[PDB]
Amino acid sequence: HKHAIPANIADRCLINPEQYETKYKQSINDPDTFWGEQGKILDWITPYQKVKNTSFAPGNVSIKWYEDGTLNLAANCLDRHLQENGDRTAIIWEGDDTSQSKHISYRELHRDVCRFANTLLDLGIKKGDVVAIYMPMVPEAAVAMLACARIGAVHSVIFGGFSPEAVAGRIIDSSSRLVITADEGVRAGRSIPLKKNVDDALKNPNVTSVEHVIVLKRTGSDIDWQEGRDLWWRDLIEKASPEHQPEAMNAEDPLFILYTSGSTGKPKGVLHTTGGYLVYAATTFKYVFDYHPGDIYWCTADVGWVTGHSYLLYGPLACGATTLMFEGVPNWPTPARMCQVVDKHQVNILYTAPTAIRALMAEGDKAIEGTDRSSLRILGSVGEPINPEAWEWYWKKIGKEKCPVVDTWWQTETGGFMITPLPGAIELKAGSATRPFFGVQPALVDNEGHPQEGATEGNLVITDSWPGQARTLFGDHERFEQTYFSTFKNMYFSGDGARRDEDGYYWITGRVDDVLNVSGHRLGTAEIESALVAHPKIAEAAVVGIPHAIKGQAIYAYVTLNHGEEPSPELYAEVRNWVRKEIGPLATPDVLHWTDSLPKTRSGKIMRRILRKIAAGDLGDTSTLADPGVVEKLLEEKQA
Ligand SMILES: Nc1ncnc2c1ncn2[C@@H]1O[C@@H]2COP(=O)(O)O[C@H]2[C@H]1O
Ligand SMILES: [Mg+2]
């Protein structure tokens, strides 16, 4: 069942089916001409000559785009829009409480970003310095990010739900010089203690690089204050000059670092540079959401994740869009909140997550009760697999069967959309990302790296570079090469599995490595295991994801206790909270399963496949296990 392109969309679309085919073919056969022309979506201070200069060679990965060009991201997202569109709203802010909202014009946003860029410079922050941003969804988070970009500082945004330990780890790895935070965040009526978490992070003796903490007064709560180190946002920004001249950055100057979980090890700082990244974010934003001047756009993703970088802020602001930043959650105070915001601000494009869609869908018509939704024209889904039922419920109930849904597949390491419909070019299948974006060459390979042709399934790789590609892991280019470019030589390995059907449409089925996706949050199996075994009473741990009707995956942990310890309600609570402390509430196990029967190879390594099946409630081949006998026991313990 393919959904046709509706006439209202065909009448206005930027890219129709023929235009998609022609552009795609040029983008693959001649990326230098294609991207040389498409790069002019940005203002360049000096033009590039060389466009594509890349190699996925084993142990010798090198990625450069537009390398001789110079530009400024903040000038592209702000300054260049002033003369004609200074009075256009850049950010609509909607508070957690519906009585609270703000409209911030391109001129107002520009003025505050200039003031804060001057604030950063005056504090001694320079081009290349890393600035940690630990902020709630308020416009000042955007001001901070844009001001860093404006001066060539490298921001590292840390999701507000991370624990003090997790904050400290990111600060340590990045040598962040400055932390920007708020006293508290406000979410679903509740307060989250951000500044206190920062205090606790900075007590880590290995945190040595932070000289100041800028604090936004969001709630005015009683916080501890360290004289000298801590500074109030308002105090600083009101002192600063609103005049700031943007300087030119090289296309390959680092723009930001975003700490990202892997199949093994601890989170690594995925690094994006400036030129290719912004070209790709602007281009994908424009064509996939069919952006026309005047369109009101709402991405629901947090600023702390890559969607919040590329599609809440940089893509839409580069294009001069009005972008909506919502402080709260889609179902507070009631399940109808998301569609109430749509109505309130006459949103035309809605881009949200399958977990959110499923949480609303569980409430049924209470999600749309009393709302109109007629301003919507385009819908999109981000960040995790979406099954056909949820897709159809979204398309029907939120979009009233009138709105194409763009199910966008991409990753933190890809910078922007990779496989996605375009609303006026591609007919839709519920649950399918459909076809690759311009400049993207996907392939499916078996475990031996052999490309599979026709209708088939396998490991999803990308066989050549694209302008938005992450360039490295901060301080760890060899691990970058290992993780993404060693499994299948000369290819980018996404870590995802996919199916291609007889029409050539792609269906992404989930991670094939040990990365979990819990409510849209990317977590590592090994890092959660490491968190658990750090507990004084825990000897060993094996973590698996299991299907969950709302969250997509839930976290199931098998735990082996030290000799002398017994399970108890106290210990159950303590271990769950231990993971909440080491990483954050986002990584809290849903289930703890106490056992002494972890399956292991004869070399001693944990075997997780059977554990996954058992936890799911299901078996496989046990001939690699040093003791098959564990299986039966594990089946009994889960029965109880
Ligand atoms: N539309 C989608 N369908 C299936 N999987 C997705 C989709 N979008 C993102 N993902 C995966 O979910 C992961 C979440 O973290 P990342 O964005 O880093 O990388 C992402 C992809 O591997
Ligand atoms: Mg221990």
From Swiss-Prot:
The keyword Nucleotide-binding applies. It catalyses: acetate + ATP + CoA = acetyl-CoA + AMP + diphosphate. InterPro entries: Ac_CoA_lig (IPR011904), ACAS_N (IPR032387), AMP-bd_C (IPR025110), AMP-bd_C_sf (IPR045851), AMP-binding_CS (IPR020845), AMP-dep_synth/lig_dom (IPR000873), ANL_N_sf (IPR042099). GO terms for molecular function: acetate-CoA ligase activity; AMP binding; ATP binding; metal ion binding. ATP binds at residues 383-385, 407-412, 496, 511, 522. Keywords: Acetylation, ATP-binding, Ligase, Magnesium, Metal-binding, Nucleotide-binding. Acetylated. Deacetylation by the SIR2-homolog deacetylase activates the enzyme. Changing residue 522 to A: Results in a 2-fold reduction in the catalytic efficiency for both ATP and CoA. 3-fold increase in the affinity for ATP and 4-fold reduction for CoA. Changing residue 190 to A: Results in a 2-fold reduction in the catalytic efficiency for both ATP and CoA. 2-fold increase in the affinity for ATP and 3-fold reduction for CoA. One of its GO terms (cellular component) is cytosol. CoA binds at residues 187-190, 307, 331, 519, 580. Changing residue 580 to A: Results in a 2-fold reduction in the catalytic efficiency for both ATP and CoA. 2-fold increase in the affinity for ATP and 7-fold reduction for CoA. GO terms for biological process: acetyl-CoA biosynthetic process; acetyl-CoA biosynthetic process from acetate; chemotaxis. Mg(2+) binds at residues 533, 535, 538. Changing residue 513 to P: Results in a 2-fold reduction in the catalytic efficiency for both ATP and CoA. 3-fold reduction in the affinity for ATP and 4.5-fold reduction for CoA. The modification N6-acetyllysine is found at residue 605. Its cofactor is Mg(2+). It is an enzyme of class 6 (ligase). Changing residue 605 to A: No acetyl-coenzyme A synthetase activity. Its EC number is 6.2.1.1. The record marks 513 as: Hinge residue important for conformational flexibility. Monomer. This is Acetyl-coenzyme A synthetase.
